[PDB]
């Protein structure tokens, strides 16, 4: 029908910003025709969008003002959008505005009575989109107009967690001030502290510790200290060790994991730190000859050269200068501390294999890749 093409014209006008031609196309219509043309879900570029939500997405605030003031377009009409590569089903205009960072459109929608806590199919509130993008102005304006900071999403991810993972320190501080629970756990038991420790954002860790966050072990069996050690975040490891009264086994575990992770991380490769942390943990294992904290080593792994992990300071000093042995020791310690739990520990193995292949030592590369594949099954 020609009304469908006219709805296409209206959608193009709203999606580009032309307020005058939009009012021209919407002029002297009937409320029936108004509702039809403004509720017609289109489909341009893998996005199913009604004129209001495409306008709010593209940040054309005067268009949204026309729609909200001269007409009364339904404020909770939903569609499907695309942010970079992600597809988002069940999004409202306010959510798209809060995500794309159009503070003017956010205010226009909130003032005219939009559901501030409307959720996505992934159960994402617009407050969570704002915390993702880091727009503290939008976060503040939403919270002021009674947006619920507690609403988690599909996988029980809060606004605090996504704010801590992305690094928006000021938004994290604001949320913590607004009585946001720092000990909120995700579906797997991970807190915002785990996410902040992985990314290395140390200021977020400082703020979370200031608000008395708790070091909980997630379902993967990892303290935030273990998360920081595994990710070669030495600053976070030192901070968490200083604040928490970690027992000697946890501290030695963290030191050994941090040292081992420095041996096969492409970004943080540092053999001297590897040996330093491994040797420090060994020394503290042998601090008291009458109370030696022995290490329950795993059986020899053929791909790692059938080598057994060093069990005393002499065995570790023996490989102080053997760079290859230190690589293999890092892999062994990573597998001993993490392999039991449900963790994909295969990536540094593949990296060490790739380096050995770059140096044309094909046999060891193939051994390492075979072991990684055997671990995956």
């Amino acid at each position: 029908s020609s009304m469908e093409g006219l709805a296409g014209y209206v959608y193009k006008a709203a999606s580009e910003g032309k307020v005058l031609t939009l009012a021209a196309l919407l002029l002297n219509r009937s409320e029936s025709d108004i509702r039809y043309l403004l509720g017609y879900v289109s489909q341009q570029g893998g996005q199913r969008s009604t004129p209001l939500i495409i306008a709010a997405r593209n940040g054309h605030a005067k268009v949204v003002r026309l729609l909200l003031e001269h007409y009364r377009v339904q404020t909770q009409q939903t569609g499907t959008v695309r942010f970079d590569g992600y597809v988002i089903d069940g999004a409202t205009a306010l959510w798209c505005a809060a995500g794309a960072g159009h503070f003017e459109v956010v205010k226009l929608l909130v003032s005219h009575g939009a559901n501030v806590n409307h959720t996505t199919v992934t159960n994402s509130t617009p407050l969570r989109a704002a915390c993702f993008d880091g727009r503290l102005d939008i976060v503040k304006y939403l919270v002021e107009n009674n947006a619920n900071i507690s609403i988690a999403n599909k996988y029980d991810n809060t606004c605090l967690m996504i704010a801590a993972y992305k690094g928006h320190t000021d938004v994290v501080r604001y949320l913590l001030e607004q009585r946001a629970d720092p000990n909120a756990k995700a579906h797997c038991g991970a807190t915002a502290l785990h996410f902040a420790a992985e990314a290395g954002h140390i200021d977020i860790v400082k703020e979370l510790i200031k608000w008395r966050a708790a070091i909980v072990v997630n379902g993967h069996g990892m303290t935030p200290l273990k998360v920081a050690a595994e990710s070669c975040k030495a600053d976070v490891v030192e901070l968490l060790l200083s604040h928490a009264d970690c027992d000697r086994r946890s501290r030695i575990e963290a030191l050994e994991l941090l040292g081992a992770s420095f041996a096969n991380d492409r970004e943080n490769y540092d053999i001297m730190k590897t040996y330093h942390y491994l040797y420090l943990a060994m020394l503290e294992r042998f601090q008291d000859g009458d109370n030696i904290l022995e290490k329950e080593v795993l059986p020899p792994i053929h791909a790692y050269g059938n080598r057994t992990e060093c069990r005393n300071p002499q065995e570790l000093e023996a490989i102080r200068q053997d760079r290859d042995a230190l690589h293999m020791e890092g892999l062994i310690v990573r597998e001993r501390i993490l392999g039991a739990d449900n963790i994909d520990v295969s990536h540094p193995i593949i990296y060490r294999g790739a380096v050995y292949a770059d140096n044309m030592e094909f046999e060891q590369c193939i051994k390492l890749w075979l072991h990684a594949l055997h671990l995956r099954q």
Partner: protein, 66 residues
Amino acid sequence: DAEAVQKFFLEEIQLGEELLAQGEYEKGVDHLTNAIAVCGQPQQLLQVLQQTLPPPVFQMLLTKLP
């Protein structure tokens, strides 16, 4: 002819839009008047233009009323 009238109204509004955006305010006001005169009742049209336009171009447009 109703087809020609509707297409002319839309055309003049688009021409307005672009000319106003470029900076040629007077020719845009001319095309806006071309559209308004062929409008059955530009009541809400003038009311919208009251907000979606700077004051001076609105004064020029109202001086272009007849």
